[PDB]
Design a binder for this molecule. Sequence first.
Ligand SMILES: [Cu+]
Length: 75
Amino acid sequence: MGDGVLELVVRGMTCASCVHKIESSLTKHRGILYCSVALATNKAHIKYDPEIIGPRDIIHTIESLGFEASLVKIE
Ligand SMILES: [Cu+]
């Protein structure tokens, strides 16, 4: 079994000070099991909990900082 694994692209992550802030901020959600962001890929390997959280929420958070995102893994 496994949680809602959703390695979406996250952009605007201009430095480590973005990356760890995004990480730490997202990890505030109980509706996640993991987040592993990287500005190399421009991504967020979140595992988002699908009872509490939808991708929209993570996006809202990302936006509510100063960042943007897109699910590369559509299909
Ligand atoms: Cu930054």
